[PDB]
Amino acid sequence: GSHMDDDLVDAEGNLVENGGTYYLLPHIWAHGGGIETAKTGNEPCPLTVVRSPNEVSKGEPIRISSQFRSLFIPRGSLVALGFANPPSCAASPWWTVVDSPQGPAVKLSQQKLPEKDILVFKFEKVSHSNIHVYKLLYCQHDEEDVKCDQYIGIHRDRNGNRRLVVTEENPLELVLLKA
């Protein structure tokens, strides 16, 4: 047997498939649509992970992978998040957090990444039971083994890009729809 409610759940009540693709949507419709990429700052192409401003858009299917190959993703598991179909100028589909004067930001990279650079996310079910809504934690380095005390949120640059970045308040609250 298996511990009850011990795995990530999608919008339809079915357990999240380890390695499967999902649209990451905000629980609150008015907040926007799914996940996309955009070219910001001095990037030569789309390397910034962002949230679509279109509430109707489900955005890109996002692959969610745990460290080990189990069927489902146990609650509290460190995970990697990547685009099933990444922008062509990215060298890998996996998201990664990079420092910037505007605070840590979720980006893609034009080179291959070491796994301590991608296994840095962790979902955390939002306390207002059910509905299966999750906050997204970013996990930095304690020294050796990991501390997840930072939440991913949105930052609208003045070009209207709703960038995913580690923020102080208003963390994301996502529902995962099977893609």
Curated annotation (Swiss-Prot):
Coverage span on the entire protein: 25 to 199 of 207
Family: Belongs to the protease inhibitor I3 (leguminous Kunitz-type inhibitor) family.
Disulfide bridges in this chain: 45-89, 139-148
Lineage: Eukaryota, Viridiplantae, Streptophyta, Embryophyta, Tracheophyta
Site entry (Reactive bond for chymotrypsin), positions: 69-70
GO terms for MF: serine-type endopeptidase inhibitor activity
Keywords, alphabetical: Disulfide bond, Protease inhibitor, Serine protease inhibitor, Signal
Function in brief: Inhibits alpha-chymotrypsin at the molar ratio of 1:2 in state of 1:1.
Protein name: Chymotrypsin inhibitor 3
